[model samples]
Target: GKKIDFLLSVVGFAVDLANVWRFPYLCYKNGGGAFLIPYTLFLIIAGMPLFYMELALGQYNREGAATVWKICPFFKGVGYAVILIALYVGFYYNVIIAWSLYYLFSSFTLNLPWTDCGHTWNSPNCTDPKLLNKYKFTPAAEFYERGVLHLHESSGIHDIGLPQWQLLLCLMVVVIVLYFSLWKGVKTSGKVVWITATLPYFVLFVLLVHGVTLPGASNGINAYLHIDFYRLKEATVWIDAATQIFFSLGAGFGVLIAFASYNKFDNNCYRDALLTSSINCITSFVSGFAIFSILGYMAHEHKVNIEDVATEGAGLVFILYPEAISTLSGSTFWAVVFFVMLLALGLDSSMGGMEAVITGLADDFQVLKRHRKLFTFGVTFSTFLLALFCITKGGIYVLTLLDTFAAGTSILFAVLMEAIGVSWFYGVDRFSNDIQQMMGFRPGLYWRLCWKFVSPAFLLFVVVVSIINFKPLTYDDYIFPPWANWVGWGIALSSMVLVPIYVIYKFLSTQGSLWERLAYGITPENEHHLVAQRDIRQFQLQHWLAI
Candidate 1:
C-alpha cells in the first residue's frame, strides 16, 4: 500500500533537521543541563500525543486531514485553513533552502570572499582600500571592531557572502532539482529521500568526530551542559521549548496525516507514532553534542569565553555556527559537507510540506483527478515565484513576520481545534471501534486518555502563552521601510480570518434544519461512510492498528 518509500525517508528526514543543528545550540544557551528536564517532558506529553492524533486522523479518514475535518460538516472550515498555511509555508520556506544552496556553493572557493582581509575581518588588513572597494565596505566600525567581520566573530567561521549573480544561480538550481524530484509524484520523491534522509546523519557523525578531536572542544561541551536551574523560571524559555518541540516534531502540520493516507488500513499507527517521537527526541540530544563540541574548539582557538561562542535561536545556526565551521582543518571540505547537510535536511522537509499542500488542493478542487502533473507544477512553481519575493533585500523581515504570526500562533490554534473535534464531536469510542475493526486490537486506555485530555490541555497552554507573549512589530528596523510590516501583518491576518468566514458562508448556504444539526452531533457512526468507500477501505487498513 505504501507506493512512496520516499515518504518514509522524508518523514524521518524532516524530523531530523528540525532538531539536529538548532536544538543543540538552544540546549546549550538555555541553561544547557537544566533545559533537558523541560525538553524531555514536553516531548512526551506534547510532541508524542499530538503526533499520534494527526496520524490516526489521517488513517481514519483515508483522506487529506483537511477533508477529514468534514466529520462535522460545520467544522470543515478548519481543513481549508490548514491548506492555506501549507501553501504559504511551502512558498516561503524555499528562501531558507536557497540560502543553504548559496552557502554550499561558496564552500568550494579557496578563500571565502566574505572572510578576506577586508573591512569585514577584525584584523587591520580590513583597512586596505583595495580590499575595501572590492568588498563593498560599509562605514560601521563596530561591525569590524567586534571581530564581527570574521565569520568566526559571530561564531568564528569565515563569511563568504555571494555576489548577486551567484545567489540567483543557486536559487535556480534548487527550484530545478525540486521540480524534477516531485514531477512524478510520491514514487520519485520517496526514492530521492534515501539520500536526503541518511546523508545528514553521516555528515553529522563526521562533524562530531572532527569537532571533538579539535583543541579545546571539551570546554565548549562543558559550557553547553553547565545549566542554571533559575533560568527555567523565565516563561520565554519554556515557551521556546514547547514551540520548538511542536515545530521541530512537525506536530500540527498534517504531515503525518498525509503520510498515513498511503499506509495500509490495518497499520498500527499508535506504535509507529510513539517510535517516531522517541527517535526525534534522541536525535535532538545526540545532535547537541555534535554542535557543542565544535563550539568548544572555536572558543579555545579564539581564546574568547565559551558563552560568547555559543548562541541561541537562528543566530546560533546561521551566523555563528557557519563561522565556526569555516575554521576547520580542511575548511572548504567541511564547509561543503555542512551546507550539503543543510540542503538535504531542508529539501526533504520542504517536499513534505509541498505534498501536504498538493494533496489538500486536489481534494478541494477535484480537477486533480485528471491533471495531477499540472496540479503539482502549478503548486510548485507558483510557490517558487512567491517565495522569491521573500528572498529579496527585505526577505528576512518578511520571514520573521510569518514565523511569528502564521507559523507560531495559527498552528497552535489549529491543533487545538482538531483535538476537540476528534475527541468530543467525533466520539472517541466510535473512532476506537473503527480502529478495532481494522487492526483486530483496540487501543489501550492510555491512548484514549491522551486524545481526550493530555493533548488538548498541552495545546491550549501553548495557545494562551503565545498570545500573552505576542511581541508587536517594532518599527525601528525595516528592510522594507516600515510600510512592509503592515503589509506582512495584513497578509497573515487575511489567511487567518478567511477560513472561518468561508466556513460560515458555506454553512448558511447549505442551511440544514435543527434535526440535521442534532443528528450530526449524535451520529458519529455514520460519519465515516460519508467519505468515499475507497478512502474508508484505506483508512481501515492504515489506522486499524490502534484498535
Candidate 2:
C-alpha cells in the first residue's frame, strides 16, 4: 500500500465531520479556548497512546482487526466488537454522507432553494430570517426539516412510514460511490482518497476567509476564544474533552488498525501517528474559526446575540451555515463551495469506516478475502438497506437512536477492551518489542506508561462515567421513549456481549485446567516461537513492574 494513501486515510478518518461540528461545539460548550488544555492533556495521556497501540497492533500482526487477535487468543472477540462497531457506525454514518450529497445537489442552482420562503415545502410559520423573531421557522430550517426530510409526514419514531424516494436515491448514490471506491480495496480507495481528503482543506480556507470578512466575525471569534477558567472546574468539561479526543482521533473503530495493516512493516508509524493526529486536532480548531466567523456574521445579519445563531450538528451545517451563505453577495458560489466540501469531508470518512469493516472481516475469513468485491458489495448493500430507516420522515429519530447507541458508549467500551487486550493481556513490553522489531526502536517510557497504565485507566474512567451520567436520548424536544432507549441499549450490548461470550467460549473449548487455560488464553498463538524464546515474561512480576 502507498504510504501517502495510508497517511491520508488515517488523517481523513481522524479529521472527520465531527471535527467540523462536534469539536467546535464542545470547545464552545465546555470552556471556550480553555477547553484545549484538557483536550490536549487527554490526547497525550490516552488518545495518542491508544492510536499508536492500534497501529502497532495491526502492523505487527499484519492482519485485520478480528484476525489480529492471534496475539492474545482470548481477546479475539474484542476485535470482532471493533468490527461490529465499525459496521454499526456505517449503518447510520453513510446516511449523513447522503444528506451532504443531497445538499450538494441542491446547491447547484442560480438561486439557492434554501434561501427563499415561498417554496411548497415551506410551512405557514415560515418567516424571513432577517425578521429575527422567535418561534418562526427560517427558510433554511424549512428547507432542511420540510423540504429535505419531510418530517411533517410522520409524527415520531414509531410512526415513521415509507422512505422518501429522493433521499433513497441520494443514499443509493452514496452507496454506489462507496462500492466502486472500495470494490478493489486499497488500490482503488487510496486513489479515491486523494480527492476526498484534500479538497475539504481548500474549501475550509475559502470559507474561513469569506467568513472572517463578515460583519459580526469579531464577535463570533470573541465568543469562541473567550476563556472561562471556571468552566474547566466542572466534570462535564473534562468528560467532553476526553470523549472529544476519543471520538476525534478515532482510535477504536478498527479503522486505524485496518489502515495500518496495509502499511509497510517499518513505516515509522510513531511519527505518522503524531503528525496525523495533530493535523486532525488543528483542523478541528481552525474549522471552528471558519464556523464561528460565519456564525458571528449570521448574528450580525439577524440582529441577534452570537449565541442565538450558534449551533451544532446538522443544524449548524445544513441550516445555519446555508442561511448565512445565502446572505452573501455571491451566495450561489459560496453555497456550491460549502456543500462540495461537506460532500468531500463525508466521503473520506465514510470510505475509511467501510474499509475497516471490509478489511477486518476479509482478513479473518478466507472466502471473503477471495471474493473481496462481492464482500464489499454485500457490506455496502447491507448498510444501505439498514439506512433506509433513516431516510423516512421519522428517520431523524431513528438516526438519533443509532447515533446515541450504535457507536457512542459501545465504541468506548470496545476501545476500553482494546486497551486492556493490548496493554494487560498481550503485555505492553512485548508490544514494544514488536514495535522495535519493525521500527528498530522501542517506544519510550512515556508511551509505555500510558499504554500500560494511563490510557486503559482513562478509558475505563470515561466508560463508567458515561454510563453513570447517561441521560435519556432526545432530539431537541422529542424525548425518546423508554422502549427506544431499551432498543438503543440493545444495539450497544449486541457488540459488547461478543467480548464476554467469546471469552467464555475460549475458556470452555481449550483442553486444559483453569490455570492452563488461562495461560494458553493470554499467550500469542501466531508467534509461538517468540513466546518460547522470550521465557514467558508475562507471568513475571517484572513484566508488570518494569518501566
Candidate 3:
C-alpha cells in the first residue's frame, strides 16, 4: 500500500522547474544523448548519495539538518551555513515565482506580449535604447549565454524591457501570492503543493501529445537524444552536468532536510529519498519528448537549424521557448498552458525552498519559532522587497549576479561541505546504522561506498573545474564592474563566513579541558563543551518528524 506521506515526499521532491525546463535544455546543449552519460554519472555520484545522507541524517537526529549537524558541536556551523543559504535562496527564488505568476496571468490573454512580433515583443523592445545605457551584466552574462551572445541578440529576445510599472506590478503579485500561500505555514503551504505540484504533469502530458503530432517533432527528439561524445571532453560539459544534477535533485541546500523534518521517524526515508530521486530523473527523461517536440516543430516551421532554437540556462525558458511555443498550433492556447505550467512548476519548488529556509531557521533559533508565522511573513516580505533591486530597469544584471555568484557558486561548495561532514566527520557506518534502525533494512554496500568516496570525489572534481574555467559573461556589452563583482562574491561569502565565525564565537565563549579543547577545537575547556547541549528528554523523533 502507498501512503500520502510518500506521495507528499514525491510531490515535493520530484516536482521542480529544473526537471522540465533546465534539464531538457542541458540535454540539448551538452551532448544531447551523450550528455546523459555525465548526467547519470553525476546523479549517482552526487545526487543519490547526498540525498540518502540527508534523509538518513534527518531520521537519525529526528530533527532538521541544522540540528542533526549539531550532533558534532564543532560541525554545527555546517548546519548554520545550510540555513543561511536557504534563506538567501528564499529571497531570490520568489523572484522566479513572481515571474511565473506574471507569466501565468499572461497565459489567459489571447496573445502574450512576448509572443507577438510587434516592437513591444521584440528583444530589447524598449523604445529607448538609452534606457539600458547604465545597465550592468558582465561575467554573469558570459556565464549565462550558451556560448554565443550573438545568438540571443539575433533572436531579439534579450530582455523584456517592460516598463517600470509593469515590473513592480508583477513583483507585488508574486509577493502577495507567496505570502498568503505561506502565511499559515506548513498546514496551508503543504496543501498548496497539491495543485502546484501535480498540474505540470497534466500540462506536460497535453503538450507532449500535441508536440509529437507536429511536423519535425521527431527530429527535435533525435537531436536532443543524439550524443556528441567529442563535446564531452570540454570541461563546461561536465560542469553543466554536475550543476544540473545538483539543481535537479535540490541537494546541498538543506531543503530536503527541512522537508524530511516533517516526516515520521519510522517513515523509511531511505526508501523515500530513493523514490523521490528516481521519480525526479524519470520525469525529466519522460518530459524530454514534450519539450524537444516543440523545439523540433519550431525548427521545422522556421526552417532554422535546430541548434539555433536550442539554448541553455534561463534564456531557454525566458526567451527561446516562449518564441518557439508561440509558433505552435493554437499558439495562444499553448502559450498560456506552457507558461501556466511553468508557473505551477516554479511555484511549487520555490515555496518549498521558502519553507525550508523558514523552518530551518525556526528550528535553529527558538525565538524565531515562537512567532514562526510572523517571522516567516517578515522574512518573505523583506526578502521580496530587497529583491526589487533585481526587478529594476537593469534587473537582469542583478539576476545574473544571483545566478552565477550567489546561487551557482554557493551550491557547489554547499554540496562539498555536506558530503565532507556526512562522509568524513560523521562516519558513514554510523549514519548507515541509524538508517538501518529506522528503515528496518540496511542501505547495503553500494550506498555506503557511494556516500563515503564516490560522491565526494566527483563533486570535488566538478567544483575545481568550474572554478578554474570560470569565465564571466557580459550583458549588453557591459562587463561586470568591480563593485557588481564584489556583490556577487558577497552573497557567496556571507554564507561561507557564517559557519566558521559562529563556531569560533561559540567555542571561545565556552570553556573545556585541554584534551576536549584539542579534540573539539575549542578553548576554555570547562566553559566550551564540544558536544551539543541538546535536551535528550525533549528530543522526540516522532514529534520532530511531525514538525
lDDT of 2 by residue, 2-75 (tens): 87776676666556766765565566555367777777788778888888888888788888888888878887
- Please report how far candidate 3 places residue 42 from its true position, in Å: 1.0
On residues 105-169, what C-alpha lDDT tens digit does candidate 3 reach at each position?
65676645553222322334322212323111221122223121223333221352432455567
Task: Report the number of the highest-lDDT candidate.
Answer: 2
Q: Estimate each model's TM-score.
A: 0.80, 0.92, 0.82
**Residue 363, candidate 2: alpha-carbon lDDT:** 88
Clashes of 3: 23
Lowest-scoring 10 consecutive residues by lDDT in candidate 2?
307-316
The candidate 3 region of ten consecutive residues with least summed lDDT is 134-143
lDDT of 1 by residue, 1-547 (tens): 3646634543464454567655765676575657777888878887777787777778878777567666665555567666676767666566667777876665588775434444434445334223443111211222222332122222111122222344456666777777777667676666556666666667667767777777787887786677777787765567667767877877667776877777778877777777677767767776777677776775565455766643343435654455555556767777777778788877877878778777766675677846888887787778777776555443444555565456655666777777777776666776778778767877788878888788788878877887676545531222333454566556656655655775566546643565443444333345534432224322343333332
| CA lDDT for candidate 3 | 0.65
Give the residue spans of candidate 2 off by over 4 A.
1-14, 24-31, 130-136, 228-234, 310-313, 527-535
In model 2, the clashing pairs are none
Off by over 4 Å in 1: 1-14, 21-34, 112-116, 119-165, 310-315, 320-324, 472-492, 521-547
- C-alpha lDDT of all candidate models, in order: 0.63, 0.78, 0.65
